[PDB]
Structure 1
Amino acid sequence: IVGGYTCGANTVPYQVSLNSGYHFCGGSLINSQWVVSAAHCYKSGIQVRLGEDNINVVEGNEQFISASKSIVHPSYNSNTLNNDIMLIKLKSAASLNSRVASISLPTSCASAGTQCLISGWGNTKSSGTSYPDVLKCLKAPILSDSSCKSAYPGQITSNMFCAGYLEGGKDSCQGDSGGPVVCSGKLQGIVSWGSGCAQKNKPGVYTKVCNYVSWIKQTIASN
């Protein structure tokens, strides 16, 4: 997260960190047993870390659970990142508390101009490398399709949307991938790609979660 702010310990209880020796992606808890993330976060042997703030200190509220299953969307394309969505089953259930709680799936798509909360432990610098101790937060609106497609000619599909700031300065970055875009208590986006970080006329692109609510539900029911 570039140009964001410190969320505060467990103010974002559905945020998880995906760890493979190191934090490499975020994710969202949707029930006691499942995580929504980005398909391009797939790795063998992921460990899911819930209840985290300082990801570099054992602080007491953390839960550490291995991924038992890792389901990439069957139409995912890693060249274009269309259908960039993945579901992670926890080998055991998460103990839901005030520090650790799930996020609702959308009943309907959000619309351009809606304000959202983007969070994660990714890079906090444009043109550099500086990953944070504590979870970072960003307030950011869904942008219009015409803004998105003029920012990214010939690259935006019906399963993506832009959000953030055309002026730049404030954006998600490397390390936030798979992380939540929450708008009005609903999980509407997944941190996906972007051209650089926080640069002018290069907003972030996000997986349009509302297009997948039936997939998520059937997949949870079949596994």
Structure 2
Amino acid sequence: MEIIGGKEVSPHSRPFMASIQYGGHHVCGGVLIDPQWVLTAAHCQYRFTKGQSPTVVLGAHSLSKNEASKQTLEIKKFIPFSRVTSDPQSNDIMLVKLQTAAKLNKHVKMLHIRSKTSLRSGTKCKVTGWGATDPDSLRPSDTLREVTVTVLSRKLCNSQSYYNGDPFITKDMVCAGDAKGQKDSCKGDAGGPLICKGVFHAIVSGGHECGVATKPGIYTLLTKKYQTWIKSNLVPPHTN
């Protein structure tokens, strides 16, 4: 009856997944949405380093083991929703610009951004990424896993019982967790996607404690606000 957690997915069943890495170490999730662009949380950009070669890993299942599918590209420029510095609070959404477009095979595909589709609370969604299962684990998950979640209601998520206004869940964010209203995925899950009913809806917002009742996960919703932003960077490109 009790006991419940995530499960490791079928190797390379999420061809769009990407690992953001500093010095070869995974720090966040991301979603390839165009040959030379990754979408991830902005929290995921370590600012206290001019070094630590930032790299993106695609077509991977195991963060450790070698793989005929893996592709390591280099970040050309981080495009965060904030300008230079600004307020490193809300708007936890970022665009990673790669040095070269990535080879597209069956283990490495793109995921499309949501459009007209909306997201009602109560929906069963799935989070994908490399987040550890031990609240104390100092290392992320080796294999790529997946957890099921339920979109909580803002009214209930903004209650005194939950975040109670701090952070306040605006119209662009969304909550999700188990019946205990808590977050499953732990270390290294930030940046991953929130796919519901087969539609890429949001981005896992980083910087939140895992395993605490009434403290669900926050997600950045791909609202018109960010579609616009996305479209401008990716369109127009640099062809001409």
- 2:121 corresponds to which residue? 112
Match in the other structure for 2:200: 187
1:201 aligns with 2:214: yes
Deviations 1:36-56 (A, max 9, x none): 001111146420100111110
What are the within-5 Å matches in structure 2 for residues 29-178 of structure 1?
A: 29-43=32-46, 45-74=53-82, 77-78=87-88, 81-108=89-116, 109-129=118-138, 131-150=140-159, 151-154=162-165, 155=167, 156-167=169-180, 171-178=184-191
In structure 1, what residue type is equivalent to 2:121? A
Q: What amino acid sits opposite 2:230 in the alignment? A: I
**Unmatched 5+ residue regions in structure 2?**
none
Q: Tell me, yes or no, if the aligned pair for 2:191 and 2:206 is still in contact at 8 Å.
A: no
Shift of 1:113: 1.9
**So what's the TM-score if we normalise by structure 1?**
0.90
Question: How many correspondences in the alignment?
Answer: 220
CA RMSD for the aligned pairs? 2.0
Q: Structure 1 residues 138, 128: CA separation in 2 closer, same or farther (over 3 Å shift)?
A: same
**Alignment check: 8 A CA contact 1:168 1:198 kept:** no
Q: Please list every run of at least 4 consecutive aligned residues from structure 1 whose deviation after the TM superposition is greater than 4 angstroms.
A: none
Q: Give the C-alpha shift of residue 97 in structure 1.
A: 1.9
Asked if 1:219 corresponds to 2:233, the answer is: yes
Letter in 1 for 2:7: Y
For 2:138 and 2:32, how far apart are their aligned partners in 1? 27
User: SS state of the match for residue 138, structure 1?
Assistant: strand
Larger CA Rg, structure 1 vs 2: 2
Partner residue of 1:8 out of 3, 7, 10: 10
Displacement after TM superposition at 1:165 (Å): 1.4
TM-superposition CA deviations, 1:112-165 (whole Å, max 9, x none): 122222111122112444532201101112111112112111122222110121
Contact 2:18 2:56 in 1 (8 A): yes
2:22 alignment partner in structure 1: 20
Change (3 A) 1:77 1:115: farther
Q: Find the aligned partners of 1:204 and 1:5 in 2 and give their Cα distance.
A: 18
Structure 1 unaligned spans of 5+: none
CA distance in 1, matches of 2:31, 2:115: 17
The structure whose RCO (Cα within 8 Å, separation 6+) is larger is 1
Distance in 2 (alpha carbons) for counterparts of 1:55 and 1:190:
21
